[PDB]
Design an enzyme around this catalytic site. Sequence first.
Site, short mmCIF file in Angstrom:
data_model
loop_
_atom_site.label_atom_id
_atom_site.label_comp_id
_atom_site.label_asym_id
_atom_site.label_seq_id
_atom_site.Cartn_x
_atom_site.Cartn_y
_atom_site.Cartn_z
N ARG A 96 16.45 28.29 -37.52
CA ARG A 96 17.56 28.63 -38.62
C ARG A 96 18.70 29.42 -38.01
O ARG A 96 19.42 29.53 -38.81
CB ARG A 96 16.90 28.95 -39.78
CG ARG A 96 15.92 28.09 -40.38
CD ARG A 96 15.09 28.77 -41.47
NE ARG A 96 13.90 29.45 -40.78
CZ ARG A 96 13.21 30.28 -41.85
NH1 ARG A 96 13.67 30.51 -42.92
NH2 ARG A 96 12.13 30.89 -41.44
N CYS A 115 10.85 26.95 -39.57
CA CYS A 115 11.51 26.44 -38.77
C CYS A 115 12.10 27.43 -37.97
O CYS A 115 12.73 28.34 -38.57
CB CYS A 115 13.00 25.64 -39.40
SG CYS A 115 14.27 25.30 -38.13
N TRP A 132 18.41 19.90 -31.87
CA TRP A 132 18.13 19.68 -30.61
C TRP A 132 16.87 20.31 -30.28
O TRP A 132 16.05 21.12 -31.06
CB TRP A 132 19.13 20.49 -29.57
CG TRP A 132 19.54 21.90 -30.03
CD1 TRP A 132 18.80 22.88 -29.60
CD2 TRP A 132 20.31 21.98 -30.47
NE1 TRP A 132 19.49 24.14 -30.17
CE2 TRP A 132 20.42 23.65 -30.78
CE3 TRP A 132 21.59 21.74 -31.38
CZ2 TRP A 132 21.42 24.55 -31.36
CZ3 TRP A 132 22.62 22.44 -31.99
CH2 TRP A 132 22.43 23.76 -31.94
N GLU A 174 8.21 21.66 -27.82
CA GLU A 174 7.82 20.57 -28.59
C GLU A 174 7.46 19.27 -27.73
O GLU A 174 6.49 18.71 -28.12
CB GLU A 174 8.75 20.29 -29.58
CG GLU A 174 9.38 21.40 -30.65
CD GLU A 174 10.63 20.98 -31.18
OE1 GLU A 174 10.55 20.06 -32.13
OE2 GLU A 174 11.56 21.48 -31.00
C1 HEM Z 1 19.07 23.00 -34.22
C2 HEM Z 1 17.77 23.08 -33.32
C3 HEM Z 1 16.29 23.23 -34.03
C4 HEM Z 1 15.29 23.74 -33.65
C5 HEM Z 1 15.21 24.12 -32.17
C6 HEM Z 1 14.25 23.56 -34.45
C7 HEM Z 1 12.98 23.93 -34.19
C8 HEM Z 1 11.84 23.63 -34.96
C9 HEM Z 1 10.63 23.59 -34.57
C10 HEM Z 1 9.99 23.80 -33.18
C11 HEM Z 1 9.76 23.26 -35.71
C12 HEM Z 1 8.23 23.33 -35.84
C13 HEM Z 1 7.74 22.03 -36.00
C14 HEM Z 1 6.92 21.20 -35.08
O1 HEM Z 1 6.31 22.09 -34.20
O2 HEM Z 1 6.59 20.03 -35.32
C15 HEM Z 1 10.73 23.14 -36.78
C16 HEM Z 1 10.52 22.94 -38.00
C17 HEM Z 1 11.13 22.45 -39.19
N1 HEM Z 1 12.57 22.36 -38.90
FE1 HEM Z 1 13.91 22.97 -37.52
N2 HEM Z 1 14.55 23.08 -35.68
C18 HEM Z 1 16.10 22.73 -35.63
C19 HEM Z 1 17.00 22.38 -36.58
C20 HEM Z 1 16.62 21.90 -37.71
C21 HEM Z 1 17.53 21.21 -38.55
C22 HEM Z 1 19.13 20.93 -38.13
C23 HEM Z 1 16.71 21.17 -39.75
C24 HEM Z 1 17.15 20.56 -41.26
C25 HEM Z 1 18.50 20.33 -41.39
C26 HEM Z 1 15.62 21.69 -39.52
C27 HEM Z 1 14.48 21.63 -40.63
C28 HEM Z 1 13.19 22.06 -40.17
C29 HEM Z 1 12.05 22.03 -41.35
C30 HEM Z 1 12.33 21.45 -42.81
C31 HEM Z 1 10.89 22.25 -40.74
C32 HEM Z 1 9.60 22.47 -41.03
C33 HEM Z 1 8.46 21.24 -41.14
C34 HEM Z 1 7.37 21.91 -41.92
O3 HEM Z 1 7.37 22.30 -43.15
O4 HEM Z 1 6.24 21.17 -41.55
N3 HEM Z 1 15.49 21.95 -38.42
N4 HEM Z 1 12.00 23.31 -36.23
C1 LIG Z 2 15.70 18.76 -36.76
C2 LIG Z 2 14.68 19.03 -35.63
C3 LIG Z 2 14.67 19.84 -34.48
C4 LIG Z 2 13.65 19.99 -33.64
N1 LIG Z 2 13.81 21.10 -32.61
N2 LIG Z 2 12.46 19.56 -33.85
C5 LIG Z 2 12.36 18.84 -34.80
C6 LIG Z 2 10.79 18.18 -35.30
C7 LIG Z 2 10.06 19.32 -35.70
C8 LIG Z 2 9.72 18.77 -37.17
C9 LIG Z 2 10.46 19.11 -38.32
C10 LIG Z 2 10.00 18.85 -39.62
F1 LIG Z 2 10.68 19.01 -40.67
C11 LIG Z 2 8.89 18.08 -39.75
C12 LIG Z 2 8.21 17.90 -38.84
C13 LIG Z 2 6.86 17.12 -38.90
C14 LIG Z 2 5.76 17.89 -38.23
C15 LIG Z 2 4.40 16.81 -38.30
C16 LIG Z 2 3.37 17.36 -39.30
C17 LIG Z 2 2.06 17.12 -38.78
C18 LIG Z 2 2.32 16.74 -37.19
N3 LIG Z 2 3.80 17.24 -37.04
C19 LIG Z 2 8.51 18.15 -37.51
C20 LIG Z 2 13.41 18.54 -35.83
#
Ligand code: HEM
Ligand SMILES: Cc1cc(N)nc(CCc2cc(F)cc(CC[C@@H]3CCCN3)c2)c1
Lengths: 420, 414
Positions: free
Chosen positions: A120, A117, A289, A294
């Site tokens: 963070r 993430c 947000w 994305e």
């Molecule tokens: C507040 C603004 C936030 C932004 C801009 C953000 C951005 C991102 C992005 C760009 C990813 C990559 C996932 C993808 O490309 O699909 C990610 C992953 C992730 N985010 Fe954040 N996020 C935010 C908030 C949060 C919050 C509030 C949580 C949980 C309380 C969180 C938990 C996670 C987790 C667990 C992943 C990992 C998914 C995985 O392991 O495949 N995020 N985040």
């Molecule tokens: C909370 C939040 C904020 C933010 N900016 N973006 C997200 C969505 C990112 C994300 C956060 C997350 F925890 C899990 C996923 C699923 C990813 C899948 C796995 C295969 C294809 N994609 C995606 C969540």
Amino acid sequence: RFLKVKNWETDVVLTDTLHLKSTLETGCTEHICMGSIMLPSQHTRKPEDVRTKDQLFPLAKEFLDQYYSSIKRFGSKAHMDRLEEVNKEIESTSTYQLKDTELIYGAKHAWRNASRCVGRIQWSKLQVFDARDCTTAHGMFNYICNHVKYATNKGNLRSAITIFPQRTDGKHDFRVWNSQLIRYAGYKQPDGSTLGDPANVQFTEICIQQGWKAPRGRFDVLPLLLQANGNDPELFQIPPELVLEVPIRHPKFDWFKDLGLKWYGLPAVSNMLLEIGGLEFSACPFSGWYMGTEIGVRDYCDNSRYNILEEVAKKMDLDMRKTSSLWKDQALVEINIAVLYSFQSDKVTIVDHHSATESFIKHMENEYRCRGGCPADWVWIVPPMSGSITPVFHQEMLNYRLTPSFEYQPDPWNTHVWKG
Amino acid sequence: RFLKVKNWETDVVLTDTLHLKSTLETGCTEHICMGSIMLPSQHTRVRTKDQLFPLAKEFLDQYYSSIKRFGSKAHMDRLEEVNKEIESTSTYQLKDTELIYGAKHAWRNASRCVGRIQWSKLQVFDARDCTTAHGMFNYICNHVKYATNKGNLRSAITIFPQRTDGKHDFRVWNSQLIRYAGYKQPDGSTLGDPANVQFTEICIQQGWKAPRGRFDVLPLLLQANGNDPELFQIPPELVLEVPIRHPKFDWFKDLGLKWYGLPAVSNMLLEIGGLEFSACPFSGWYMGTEIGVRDYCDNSRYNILEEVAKKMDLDMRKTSSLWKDQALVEINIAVLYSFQSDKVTIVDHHSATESFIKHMENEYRCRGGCPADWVWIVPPMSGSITPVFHQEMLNYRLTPSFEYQPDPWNTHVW
Ligand code: HEM
Ligand SMILES: Cc1cc(N)nc(CCc2cc(F)cc(CC[C@@H]3CCCN3)c2)c1
Ligand code: HEM
Ligand SMILES: Cc1cc(N)nc(CCc2cc(F)cc(CC[C@@H]3CCCN3)c2)c1
Ligand SMILES: C[C@H](O)[C@H](O)[C@H]1CNc2nc(N)[nH]c(=O)c2N1
Ligand SMILES: C[C@H](O)[C@H](O)[C@H]1CNc2nc(N)[nH]c(=O)c2N1
Ligand SMILES: [Zn+2]
């Protein structure tokens, strides 16, 4: 043992000691690196793997040690009493209940520990909604509606998570069957083309089978499919006035609005599993947000998603005959300009990938200084466009697993025992 | 133990068994992934009599397998002959055929290289008879002319004598055969290539007469048999350069940008069957992003983004206008356009990554796998619209291999 990471753009070197507190495994060995495997076995949680007393109290004790340290009460009487109380509750009831303070700490630290993430820096400002008193899918719908309204805040987005009851025997799980709370439907046409979001075809078909009347448009917000207490899931429609959407236009290209694109404002992941002190919270939707890419890179321009590069490049009248014209790269930038322009113009919170990666570097350095490290997955942290002109590209990162954590879990339609 | 990789754009799944033949180490453990560390200790580099014969045996085993003579008289004879020579001389010499095989397979095994679809067409120049720096210079000029081929670039490697006692090392002190000088200005900034400020100093601080310009081709600093290194100027008529213009922006030429045609890495170590070739410069042809994204737009390099964006009159007040991203695309259009106009071989990142996926498919089918380092294979711009972004990859270390080695000036017993 100490470990150093170097930023090759600035020569800043940081020292990681936090990796010594790592428990879970990475999937790598000295003979193979699995750093680009999307969902390795170590990052998922099969619901059949329900924990025994055997393994649960050490997981509780380690969580509670971390909790009481963070409140400067390690070894206190409150600390020792709580350990005693949890111990008796485990051997008596085979599980245990977290206090409200422990739950909030746990959910904040699962995000803090999420090495994929980039957002963070915000981890300490998470609104935790305790939904552990919920018993029915209808109650889940109500909690989720309130989460969506609170998080959306008329465009001034606020981070939030809603935590439903923990797993017991793995036979009474609470699950949100949607991968995200707000997502567009996808429909496979008989001619093989797809209408809407190709990523959601399978889930759309389930919803339709469960009785959803599909509008069959390109941007139909999917219903919620909610499972309480291991019962069959039930369908609910989010009130449309709670679903904030943004029509996509371009600040220079007036024809861009005519592509008919929009997106929703609130990214809310709802299919992951929250692990806190060996307890498993199988339904825990969380939201923040968006980072612009994305939507503008992946959602719109992945070949297997809406895949709008050609139409955008056509309307721009780029040279599409040879790839070396970089017509794909040109259209990609313009689409991502439009996403950011549209959200900012409508005053919906969004962050561009330059801002987000710069903030993450500052966050990471702070975490090294105050916490001894910051686990980070370079493969996911680096944005999917313009990688090396963001500062994270040049940052060495160490990836390891800390608890509390978010884990993947299998899609529930593959594991659910249907009651009928 | 029999591992699968998935492409998430196409759902193609490949099964990897080749990793079970891995010999070196990754730097990762079950508790920590170091997949984004630039130079773990394992990727950098005297051999005793004991470790050398197993290494030789492993190599000869795979060589005779590759020619379908595993378990043959010729195989066993060679095994004992090298065995006899190691016992006797404390080292051994490769047959020409084994040297060519070893070099091609070192490239084949380079998990960070996106261009490996070409691995089998490499031109191997045996320079093991070389004794002096003037001889090294002659060999390198011949390499440069052969590889450049008036812009129809051809892959090549030149292999100088192998390490012996570690005191008679052959080294090319340059990181690439052709690179631009960098000087720290009195005004405080940096003229030319900031990456080469130290090496540019060591050239002057060893004898060079610098033009103190922005795109000065550096001289070669060549070290033979462990002696002191010597300066040589590559004949300018052998250094093919490309002036950088844009097919739409006439002001682009006024930026005064150029780059050289021949990417030729000269500071790595080639390991074949236990033997170490500390001087083994190799060359291919550029992928456009190497120049346009990294060389031109890295903040620690020529760092031209701001100037290009200003000339484009983009809104540079806010990062969210994506003015950097816009300029980045135009710069990389100009690079490809210029090389293509001057008929100098170049590949864009879309073509190269598509080729690598096809290469991966070939290697999985015919070899059982392909070690690949996602952090390095995915291009530095437009990552997810290239197919490699969605391709899971397994990274592991096979030999023969290219390895890093310490910069000579930190090691040289002067
Ligand atoms: C507040 C603004 C936030 C932004 C801009 C953000 C951005 C991102 C992005 C760009 C990813 C990559 C996932 C993808 O490309 O699909 C990610 C992953 C992730 N985010 Fe954040 N996020 C935010 C908030 C949060 C919050 C509030 C949580 C949980 C309380 C969180 C938990 C996670 C987790 C667990 C992943 C990992 C998914 C995985 O392991 O495949 N995020 N985040
Ligand atoms: C909370 C939040 C904020 C933010 N900016 N973006 C997200 C969505 C990112 C994300 C956060 C997350 F925890 C899990 C996923 C699923 C990813 C899948 C796995 C295969 C294809 N994609 C995606 C969540
Ligand atoms: C012919 C066209 C070739 C192309 C397009 C190409 C492309 C690339 C690129 C883009 C990189 C990334 C490194 C960086 O960004 O600085 C790389 C790495 C590498 N290339 Fe290739 N290359 C080619 C030929 C060759 C040849 C002929 C050899 C050796 C005989 C070779 C060996 C390597 C090695 C060893 C690395 C990785 C260095 C490391 O471990 O850090 N390449 N290549
Ligand atoms: C032969 C060749 C072809 C081609 N297209 N590009 C190259 C140069 C790429 C390369 C290839 C290589 F083997 C080594 C290097 C140096 C790596 C440094 C350390 C961090 C930043 N860069 C660079 C060589
Ligand atoms: C195979 C590869 O790991 C996969 O495509 C990953 C790459 N990095 C990513 N990074 C982010 N942020 N999101 C993703 O979905 C992916 N996908
Ligand atoms: C820290 C990080 O490993 C470093 O910036 C890497 C990332 N990926 C790369 N990929 C390539 N091809 N070349 C590079 O120099 C780098 N640098
Ligand atoms: Zn790893």
